[PDB]
């Protein structure tokens, strides 16, 4: 029979692993230059017909500060950039009043002598990089100057600062926080990571984005993170507190992903953890989601050869885990407790292991079974096929307490039960 599965090793993930990531040996040249210059910014802004909206935030043709060839840290920014863009408000706090660029070449640190960078909402302020980007103990905020505060979510499609980077770029970010970033627009989802668009990306042929981000606190985002074509990405330690659609939302095949002890909770509109749309071969392991809106934790859109593993998932407001239409998933020793609706569903994904799995107190099932039919739905098809079949093996763990009973399968094409307890 089986045995437990192999983890990642996360003992290297650390702060002081992640300030050694970067040469600090060749210092950068500083510039601020128009906006529109930059594939950086084209790529996810579109050509000059639609920058209206930027100038209106700077109040003439939009400029980005930017960093390139070699080693810049915040502090070396501030001493060159003019006090309108970059401004010292008191020590070491800091608004930036224009987009800041990370170019390839580029190498951007922010570390512990900023006690916050406040990105302005009003001025259209956002980081972009496509270089190597260091955030280490220490705050980015996305700031209201008008609100003189936070700038608190209010509604989807309101411009609020965000960091994005592209393909060939290498991120990390440690014992920070970051609040109120993102609003519903490609790219600025938040923190997002993403190879560059499919026709650039076969010009530039960068390879995939990376990167860490450990031990920090990500509240009020739109996403806490997204991804998208991203490899190897490793999200550990942080807390990711009332964001307001997805915790953390790695998507659009992205592989190899570590997504490990964060605690994620309060998640206002729908799930706490979800990897979509040919997510493969990640790592889900010993996370705490809880007291989200939808379900704690999400595979989504062929998304398979995964492994969740030990997550305590809990109090979710629908399922603890849900499958949709992602088949050859392990989900081995889960505590999955009290959430909602169902412990474990699984709808339309063949071949799901549930191995050592405890769902208790649920208020619908423990585990439940489904086929739907999605044609005709609003679902795309050509992008996201589908089978209406369902097919699952369970071994050992415990379903127990829930309120409609341990389980229920309707129409699986096979299910196989060995040594499962069901208390009655």
Same mark, same amino acid.
């Given at each position: 029979?089986?045995?437990?599965?192999?983890?990642?090793?996360?003992?290297?993930? =650390?702060?002081?692993?992640?300030?050694?990531?970067?040469?600090?040996?060749?210092?950068?040249? !500083?510039?601020?230059?128009?906006?529109?210059?930059?594939?950086?910014?084209?790529?996810?802004?579109?050509?000059?017909?639609?920058?209206?909206?930027?100038?209106?935030?700077?109040?003439?043709?939009?400029?980005?500060?930017?960093?390139?060839?070699?080693?810049?840290?915040?502090?070396?920014?501030?001493?060159?950039?003019?006090?309108?863009?970059?401004?010292?408000?008191?020590?070491?706090?800091?608004?930036?009043?224009?987009?800041?660029?990370?170019?390839? %070449?580029?190498?951007?640190?922010?570390?512990?002598?900023?006690?916050?960078?406040?990105?302005?909402?009003?001025?259209?302020?956002?980081?972009?990089?496509?270089? @190597?980007?260091?955030?280490?103990? %220490?705050?980015?905020?996305?700031?209201?100057?008008?609100?003189?505060?936070?700038?608190?979510?209010?509604?989807?499609?309101?411009?609020?600062?965000?960091?994005? =980077?592209?393909?060939?770029?290498?991120?990390?970010?440690? @014992?920070?926080?970051?609040?109120?970033?993102?609003?519903?627009?490609?790219?600025?989802?938040?923190?997002?990571?993403?190879?560059?668009?499919?026709?650039?990306?076969?010009?530039?042929?960068?390879?995939?984005?990376?990167?860490?981000?450990?031990?920090?606190?990500?509240?009020?985002?739109?996403?806490?993170?997204?991804?998208?074509?991203?490899?190897?990405?490793?999200?550990?330690?942080?807390?990711?507190?009332?964001?307001?659609?997805?915790?953390?939302?790695?998507?659009?095949?992205?592989?190899?992903?570590?997504?490990?002890?964060?605690?994620?909770?309060? =998640?206002? @509109?729908?799930?706490?953890?979800?990897?979509?749309?040919?997510?493969?071969?990640?790592? +889900?392991?010993?996370?705490?989601?809880?007291?989200?809106?939808?379900?704690?934790?999400?595979?989504?859109?062929?998304?398979?050869?995964?492994?969740?593993?030990?997550?305590?998932?809990?109090?979710?407001? %629908?399922?603890?885990?849900?499958?949709?239409?992602?088949?050859?998933?392990?989900?081995?020793?889960?505590?999955?407790?009290?959430?909602?609706?169902?412990?474990?569903?699984?709808?339309?994904?063949?071949? +799901?292991?549930?191995?050592?799995?405890?769902?208790?107190?649920?208020?619908?099932?423990?585990?439940?079974?489904?086929?739907?039919?999605?044609?005709?739905?609003?679902?795309?098809?050509?992008?996201?096929?589908?089978?209406?079949?369902?097919?699952? !093996?369970?071994?050992?763990?415990?379903?127990?307490?829930?309120?409609?009973?341990?389980?229920?399968?309707?129409?699986?094409?096979?299910?196989?039960?060995?040594?499962?307890?069901?208390?009655?």
């Amino acid at each position: 029979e089986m045995a437990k599965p192999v983890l990642p090793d996360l003992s290297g993930y =650390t702060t002081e692993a992640a300030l050694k990531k970067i040469a600090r040996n060749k210092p950068g040249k !500083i510039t601020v230059a128009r906006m529109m210059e930059e594939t950086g910014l084209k790529e996810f802004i579109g050509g000059d017909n639609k920058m209206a909206e930027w100038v209106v935030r700077q109040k003439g043709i939009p400029q980005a500060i930017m960093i390139s060839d070699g080693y810049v840290n915040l502090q070396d920014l501030v001493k060159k950039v003019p006090k309108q863009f970059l401004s010292e408000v008191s020590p070491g706090v800091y608004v930036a009043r224009l987009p800041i660029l990370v170019k390839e %070449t580029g190498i951007f640190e922010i570390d512990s002598k900023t006690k916050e960078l406040r990105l302005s909402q009003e001025k259209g302020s956002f980081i972009v990089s496509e270089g @190597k980007m260091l955030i280490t103990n %220490t705050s980015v905020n996305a700031w209201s100057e008008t609100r003189n505060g936070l700038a608190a979510y209010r509604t989807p499609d309101e411009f609020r600062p965000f960091v994005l =980077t592209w393909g060939g770029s290498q991120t990390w970010i440690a @014992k920070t926080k970051m609040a109120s970033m993102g609003y519903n627009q490609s790219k600025s989802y938040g923190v997002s990571i993403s190879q560059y668009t499919p026709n650039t990306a076969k010009v530039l042929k960068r390879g995939e984005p990376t990167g860490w981000i450990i031990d920090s606190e990500f509240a009020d985002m739109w996403y806490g993170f997204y991804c998208y074509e991203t490899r190897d990405f490793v999200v550990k330690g942080n807390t990711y507190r009332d964001n307001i659609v997805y915790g953390i939302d790695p998507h659009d095949r992205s592989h190899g992903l570590i997504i490990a002890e964060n605690d994620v909770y309060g =998640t206002k @509109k729908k799930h706490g953890i979800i990897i979509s749309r040919e997510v493969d071969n990640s790592f +889900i392991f010993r996370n705490k989601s809880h007291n989200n809106k939808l379900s704690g934790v999400v595979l989504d859109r062929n998304s398979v050869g995964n492994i969740v593993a030990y997550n305590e998932i809990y109090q979710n407001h %629908t399922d603890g885990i849900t499958l949709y239409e992602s088949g050859n998933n392990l989900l081995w020793g889960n505590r999955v407790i009290a959430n909602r609706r169902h412990g474990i569903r699984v709808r339309n994904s063949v071949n +799901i292991k549930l191995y050592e799995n405890v769902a208790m107190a649920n208020g619908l099932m423990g585990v439940y079974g489904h086929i739907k039919d999605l044609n005709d739905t609003d679902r795309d098809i050509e992008l996201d096929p589908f089978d209406a079949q369902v097919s699952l !093996i369970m071994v050992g763990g415990e379903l127990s307490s829930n309120g409609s009973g341990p389980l229920s399968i309707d129409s699986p094409l096979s299910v196989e039960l060995y040594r499962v307890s069901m208390l009655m």
